[PDB]
Amino acid sequence: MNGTEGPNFYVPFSNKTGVVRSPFEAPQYYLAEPWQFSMLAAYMFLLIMLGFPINFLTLYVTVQHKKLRTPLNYILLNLAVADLFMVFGGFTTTLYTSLHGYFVFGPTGCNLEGFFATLGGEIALWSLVVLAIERYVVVCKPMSNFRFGENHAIMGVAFTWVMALACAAPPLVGWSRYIPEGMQCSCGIDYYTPHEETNNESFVIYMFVVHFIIPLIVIFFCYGQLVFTVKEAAAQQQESATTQKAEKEVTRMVIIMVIAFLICWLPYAGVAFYIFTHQGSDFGPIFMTIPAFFAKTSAVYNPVIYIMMNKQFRNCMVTTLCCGKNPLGDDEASTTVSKTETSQVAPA
Amino acid sequence: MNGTEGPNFYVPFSNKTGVVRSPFEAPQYYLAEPWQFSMLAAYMFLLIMLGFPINFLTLYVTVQHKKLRTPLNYILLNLAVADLFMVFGGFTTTLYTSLHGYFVFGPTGCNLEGFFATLGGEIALWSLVVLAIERYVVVCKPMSNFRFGENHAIMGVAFTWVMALACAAPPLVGWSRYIPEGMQCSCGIDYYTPHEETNNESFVIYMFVVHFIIPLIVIFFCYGQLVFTVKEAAAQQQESATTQKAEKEVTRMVIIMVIAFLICWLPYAGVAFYIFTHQGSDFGPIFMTIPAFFAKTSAVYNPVIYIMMNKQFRNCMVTTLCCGKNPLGDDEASTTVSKTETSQVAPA
Ligand SMILES: *[C@@H]1O[C@H](CO)[C@@H](O[C@@H]2O[C@H](CO)[C@@H](O[C@@H]3O[C@H](CO)[C@@H](O)[C@H](O[C@@H]4O[C@H](CO)[C@@H](O)[C@H](O)[C@@H]4O)[C@@H]3O)[C@H](O)[C@H]2NC(C)=O)[C@H](O)[C@H]1NC(C)=O
Ligand SMILES: *[C@@H]1O[C@H](CO)[C@@H](O[C@@H]2O[C@H](CO)[C@@H](O[C@H]3O[C@H](CO)[C@@H](O)[C@H](O)[C@@H]3O)[C@H](O)[C@H]2NC(C)=O)[C@H](O)[C@H]1NC(C)=O
Ligand SMILES: *[C@@H]1O[C@H](CO)[C@@H](O[C@@H]2O[C@H](CO)[C@@H](O)[C@H](O)[C@H]2NC(C)=O)[C@H](O)[C@H]1NC(C)=O
Ligand SMILES: *[C@@H]1O[C@H](CO)[C@@H](O[C@@H]2O[C@H](CO)[C@@H](O)[C@H](O)[C@H]2NC(C)=O)[C@H](O)[C@H]1NC(C)=O
Ligand SMILES: *C/C=C(C)/C=C/C=C(C)/C=C/C1=C(C)CCCC1(C)C
Ligand SMILES: *C/C=C(C)/C=C/C=C(C)/C=C/C1=C(C)CCCC1(C)C
Ligand SMILES: CCCCCCCS[C@@H]1O[C@H](CO)[C@@H](O)[C@H](O)[C@H]1O
Ligand SMILES: CCCCCCCS[C@@H]1O[C@H](CO)[C@@H](O)[C@H](O)[C@H]1O
Ligand SMILES: CCCCCCCS[C@@H]1O[C@H](CO)[C@@H](O)[C@H](O)[C@H]1O
Ligand SMILES: CCCCCCCS[C@@H]1O[C@H](CO)[C@@H](O)[C@H](O)[C@H]1O
Ligand SMILES: [Hg+2]
Ligand SMILES: [Hg+2]
Ligand SMILES: [Hg+2]
Ligand SMILES: [Hg+2]
Ligand SMILES: [Hg+2]
Ligand SMILES: [Hg+2]
Ligand SMILES: [Zn+2]
Ligand SMILES: [Zn+2]
Ligand SMILES: [Zn+2]
Ligand SMILES: [Zn+2]
Ligand SMILES: [Zn+2]
Ligand SMILES: [Zn+2]
Ligand SMILES: [Zn+2]
Numbered sequence: 050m051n052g053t054e055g056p057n058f059y060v061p062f063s064n065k066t067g068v069v070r071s072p073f074e075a076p077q078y079y080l081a082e083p084w085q086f087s088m089l090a091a092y093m094f095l096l097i098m099l100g101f102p103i104n105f106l107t108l109y110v111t112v113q114h115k116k117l118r119t120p121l122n123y124i125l126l127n128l129a130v131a132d133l134f135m136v137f138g139g140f141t142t143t144l145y146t147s148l149h150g151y152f153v154f155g156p157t158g159c160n161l162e163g164f165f166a167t168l169g170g171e172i173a174l175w176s177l178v179v180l181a182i183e184r185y186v187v188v189c190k191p192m193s194n195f196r197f198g199e200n201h202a203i204m205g206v207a208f209t210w211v212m213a214l215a216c217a218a219p220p221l222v223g224w225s226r227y228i229p230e231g232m233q234c235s236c237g238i239d240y241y242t243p244h245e246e247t248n249n250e251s252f253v254i255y256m257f258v259v260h261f262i263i264p265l266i267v268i269f270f271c272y273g274q275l276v277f278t279v280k281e282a283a284a285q286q287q288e289s290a291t292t293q294k295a296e297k298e299v300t301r302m303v304i305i306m307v308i309a310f311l312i313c314w315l316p317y318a319g320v321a322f323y324i325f326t327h328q329g330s331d332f333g334p335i336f337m338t339i340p341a342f343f344a345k346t347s348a349v350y351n352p353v354i355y356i357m358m359n360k361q362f363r364n365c366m367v368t369t370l371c372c373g374k375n376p377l378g379d380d381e382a383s384t385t386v387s388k389t390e391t392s393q394v395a396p397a
Numbered sequence: 398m399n400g401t402e403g404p405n406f407y408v409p410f411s412n413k414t415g416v417v418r419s420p421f422e423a424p425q426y427y428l429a430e431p432w433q434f435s436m437l438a439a440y441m442f443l444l445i446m447l448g449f450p451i452n453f454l455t456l457y458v459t460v461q462h463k464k465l466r467t468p469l470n471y472i473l474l475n476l477a478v479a480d481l482f483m484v485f486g487g488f489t490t491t492l493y494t495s496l497h498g499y500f501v502f503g504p505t506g507c508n509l510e511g512f513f514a515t516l517g518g519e520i521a522l523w524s525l526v527v528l529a530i531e532r533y534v535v536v537c538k539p540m541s542n543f544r545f546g547e548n549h550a551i552m553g554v555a556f557t558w559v560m561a562l563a564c565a566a567p568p569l570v571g572w573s574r575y576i577p578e579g580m581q582c583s584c585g586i587d588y589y590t591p592h593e594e595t596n597n598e599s600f601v602i603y604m605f606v607v608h609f610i611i612p613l614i615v616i617f618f619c620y621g622q623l624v625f626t627v628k629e630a631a632a633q634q635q636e637s638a639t640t641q642k643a644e645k646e647v648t649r650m651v652i653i654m655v656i657a658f659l660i661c662w663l664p665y666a667g668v669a670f671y672i673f674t675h676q677g678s679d680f681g682p683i684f685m686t687i688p689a690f691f692a693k694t695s696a697v698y699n700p701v702i703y704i705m706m707n708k709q710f711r712n713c714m715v716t717t718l719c720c721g722k723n724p725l726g727d728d729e730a731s732t733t734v735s736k737t738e739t740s741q742v743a744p745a
Pocket of ligand 3: 050
C-alpha cells in the first residue's frame with residue numbers, strides 16, 4: 050500500500066519499514082526533517098502575530114466609527130471576526146501541533162484545527178457571493194428605489210454563517226470527518242478514505258458542489274453582469290457623479306477580493322480534489338502541506354486589501370490609531386466617520 | 398537624457414514625453430501601474446504590523462527577564478529598538494507615500510524615510526562587528542581572566558549608535574542628501590547625481606569604505622579566527638563542557654545573523670553601487686525598488702533568528718506569553734529566570 054490508513058488517519062507514507070505512527074500519538078519526523086516542522090511552527094507563529102492585530106484593529110475601527118455601516122462595512126466586520134476565530138480557534142492548535150510534530154490533543158485538536166479553517170474559508174467564500182449580489186444590485190440596480198439597509202447587511206452576514214456552518218459543522222457530527230494532512234500538522238475533510246461508516250464520499254461531493262462550484266458560478270456570472278456596466282476603468286472625481294465614481298471603487302475591490310480568494314484556495318482545493326480522485330495513490334507529505342498551509346493566509350489578506358483599497362476605512366483607521374483624530378492622509382475627500390468627531394450624520 | 402534630474406531628485410524615467418513630475422509634487426503612476434503602488438503599500442503595512450509586535454515583544458521580554466543581560470541579549474534589544482524606529486520612524490512614511498504615489502510630505506518625509514532605514518541598517522552592520530569581537534574574545538579568548546560584562550555591552554551598544562549616526566546623520570546636515578529611489582516611494586543616499594553643491598561623490602565613497610567594506614572585512618576576518626576553534630560542528634549536551642557547547646550555539650546564531658544581513662543588503666548595496674559608477678545610464682524605477690523594499694525586511698528578520706536560534710531566550714519568552722509561569726517545553730535546561738518567578742540568580 051502507498052500509504053498507511055489508520056482508523057482515524059491516513060499517513061501519505063508507506064509503513065514497509067514499519068516506521069509509521071498514528072499522528073495522534075507520536076512525532077512524524079520520519080515524514081520530513083524536524084527543521085521543516087519548525088518552519089511550520091515559525092510560520093504559524095508569525096501568522097498569529099499578524100492575524101490577531103490586523104483583524105482586531107479592523108474590528109475595533111469598524112465598531113468605533115458609527116457611520117461605517119454599509120453592506121461592505123458589515124461583511125468585512127464579519128470577515129474580521131471569522132479571521133479571529135481562525136487565529137485563536139485553530140491556529141493555536143496548528144502551531145501547537147507543528148511544535149510537537151503531531152496532534153497531541155488527538156482528534157479534538159484536529160477538529161479545532163479543521164473546523165475553524167473551514168469555517169473561515171467558507172465564510173469568506175459565501176461573503177463573496179453576498180458582495181457579488183450587493184455589488185450587482187447597486188450597479189445594475191434591479192429596483193428603481195431600493196437600498197440595502199443595515200438589516201439586509203445583517204441578513205447577508207447571518208446567511209454566510211448558516212452556509213459555512215452547513216459545510217463546517219457536519220464533519221464533527223458523523224458526516225465525513227476531519228483528518229490530518231501533509232506533514233500531519235493540519236486537518237481537513239476526508240478525501241483520502243471512503244470510510245462508509247461516516248459517509249465520506251458523499252460529503253466531499255456535497256462540499257465541492259454546494260460549497261464551491263456553485264458559489265463560484267454565481268459570483269462569476271454576477272461579474273459578467275458588471276462587465277458592460279461599472280468597469281475596472283475608474284477615472285477621477287465624479288464618473289457621472291462622485292457617487293457613481295466611488296461605486297466603481299467598491300466593485301474594483303470586491304473584484305480583487307475574489308482574485309485573492311482563488312489564489313488562496315485553488316491550489317488547496319486542487320490537490321484536495323486530485324487526492325479524492327486518486328485515493329491510495331503514491332503522493333507524499335509535502336504534496337498537501339504546501340497549499341494547506343499557504344491557504345491559511347486567508348485569515349489575513351482580506352483586511353489588507355480593505356485598508357489598501359478603501360480611503361474611508363484607512364482614514365478611519367489612521368484616525369483611530371492617531372488616538373485623537375487628524376486623519377492626515379488625503380481623507381476620503383468625501384464622507385468621513387468615527388465616534389464624537391465628524392461622525393455628524395449627513396444624509397438628506 | 399535617460400533619466401530626469403530635478404534640483405531635489407532624479408526620476409529614472411525620460412521626460413521626452415514631458416510626463417515626468419517631482420516625486421515631491423505628484424504621483425509617479427506614469428513610472429509603474431497604480432496597482433503596483435498598492436502592492437508596495439500592502440507590503441509595508443504587513444511589515445509594520447509584524448515588525449512592531451515582534452520587536453516590541455522582544456524588547457519587553459528582555460527587560461522583563463532579569464537574566465537576559467548577556468552581550469548577545471544586549472545587542473538584540475538594541476536591534477529591537479533600532480527596528481522599532483525603522484517601523485515607526487520610517488516605514489510609516491514609506492506606506493503613506495506608496496498610498497499616494499509620491500512623497501506628499503516632500504523632502505522631510507524623504508528624510509524620515511531614508512534616515513531611519515539607514516539608521517536601522519547601519520546599527521545592524523555595526524552591532525554585527527561588536528558580535529564578531531565579543532565572539533572572538535570568547536572563542537579565541539586572547540585574555541587570561543577577562544569577562545565581557547554588561548558594561549562592555551553598553552559600550553558596544555553606544556558604539557553602534559555612534560557609527561550608525563555617523564552615516565545616517567550627515568545627509569541631513571549638508572553632506573550628501575536623501576533622494577527618492579525606484580518608483581520614488583522610498584528614499585536613499587544620492588548615488589544618482591554628483592551635486593557638488595553638497596559633495597555627493599565623496600560621501601558615497603565614505604559610506605562604501607567606512608560603513609560597508611571595513612566592517613565586512615573585520616567580521617569576515619574574525620570569522621576566520623574562529624575557523625580552527627569553535628566551528629559549525631556542535632554535538633549534544635556538551636563538546637568539552639556544556640558551557641563550551643552552549644557557546645557554539647550563540648556563535649551559529651551570530652553567523653546566521655550575518656548571512657541574513659548580507660542577503661538583505663548585498664543586493665541593495667550592489668544596485669546602489671552599480672548606479673554610482675554608471676550615473677545617468679539607462680535603468681528604470683523597478684531596478685532599485687526591489688532590492689530597496691526587500692531590504693526593509695531588516696526591521697524584522699533579526700527577532701526571528703533569535704527566537705529560532707536561542708533556546709534560552711525562546712523558553713524565557715513563552716514564559717512571558719503564558720502570562721504567569723507554565724514553562725512547559727523543557728525549560729532553558731541551564732539558566733531560566735524572568736522578572737521575579739525564576740529570576741533567582743545562581744552565578745558564582
Ligand atoms: C517634463 O516635461 C514637461 C513638458 O515639457 C514639463 O511640463 C511643465 O511642467 C510644469 C510643472 O511640472 C508646468 O508648470 C506648472 O504649471 C501650473 C499651471 O497649470 C502651475 O500651477 C505650476 O506651479 C504652481 O506653483 C504654485 C506656487 O508654488 C503651487 O501652489 C502649485 O501647486 C504649482 O506648483 C507650474 O508652474 C509647465 O506648464 C509644464 N510645461 C509644459 C511644456 O507643459 C515638466 O515640468 C517636465 N518634468 C520634469 C522635468 O520633471
Ligand atoms: C507499521 O508497522 C509497525 C510494525 O508492524 C507497527 O508497530 C506496532 O505499533 C503498535 C502501536 O499501536 C504496537 O502495539 C502496542 O500497543 C499498545 C501500546 O500502548 C500495547 O498493547 C503494546 O505495547 C503493543 O505492543 C505494536 O507492538 C507495534 N508492532 C511492532 C513494533 O512490530 C506500526 O503501528 C505500523 N504503522 C501503523 C499502521 O501505524
Ligand atoms: C500506488 O501508487 C501508484 C502510483 O500512484 C499506483 O499506480 C498507478 O495505478 C493506476 C491504476 O490504479 C495506473 O493508472 C497508473 O498508471 C499507476 N502508476 C504507476 C506509477 O504505476 C498504484 O495503483 C497505487 N497502489 C494502490 C492501489 O494502493
Ligand atoms: C543613456 O543610457 C545608455 C545605456 O546605458 C548609455 O549608453 C551606454 O554608454 C556607454 C558609454 O558611453 C557605452 O559604453 C555603452 O555601450 C552604452 N550602452 C548601450 C549599449 O547602449 C548612454 O550613455 C546614456 N546617455 C546618457 C544620458 O549619458
Ligand atoms: C490548514 C487548514 C486547512 C487546509 C483548511 C481546510 C479547509 C477545507 C477542507 C476547506 C475546503 C474548501 C474551501 C474553504 C474553499 C472552497 C474549496 C474547498 C471546498 C476545497
Ligand atoms: C527602503 C530604505 C532604503 C533603500 C534604505 C537605504 C539605506 C542606505 C542608504 C543604506 C546603505 C548601506 C547599508 C545600511 C548596508 C551596507 C551597504 C550600504 C552602504 C549600501
Ligand atoms: C492550482 C491547482 C493545483 C492542482 C493540484 C495538482 C495535482 S497534480 C499530481 O501531483 C502528484 C504529486 O505526488 C504527481 O505525482 C502527479 O503526476 C500529478 O499529476
Ligand atoms: C492589498 C491589496 C491591494 C493591492 C492590490 C492592488 C489592487 S488595484 C489598485 O487599487 C488602488 C486603490 O483604490 C487604485 O487607486 C488603483 O487604480 C488600482 O489599480
Ligand atoms: C547583487 C545585485 C547586483 C546588481 C548589479 C547588476 C546590475 S546589471 C545592469 O542593469 C542595467 C539597468 O537595468 C542594464 O541596462 C544593463 O544592461 C545591466 O547589465
Ligand atoms: C507560545 C510561543 C511559541 C514559541 C514556540 C516555542 C517552542 S520551545 C521548545 O519546545 C519543545 C517541546 O514542546 C521543548 O522540548 C524544548 O526544550 C523547547 O525549547
Ligand atoms: Hg458582481
Ligand atoms: Hg491568500
Ligand atoms: Hg473615515
Ligand atoms: Hg567572529
Ligand atoms: Hg533579509
Ligand atoms: Hg526566562
Ligand atoms: Zn471507522
Ligand atoms: Zn459552506
Ligand atoms: Zn472514492
Ligand atoms: Zn490619504
Ligand atoms: Zn541643488
Ligand atoms: Zn555607520
Ligand atoms: Zn560619479
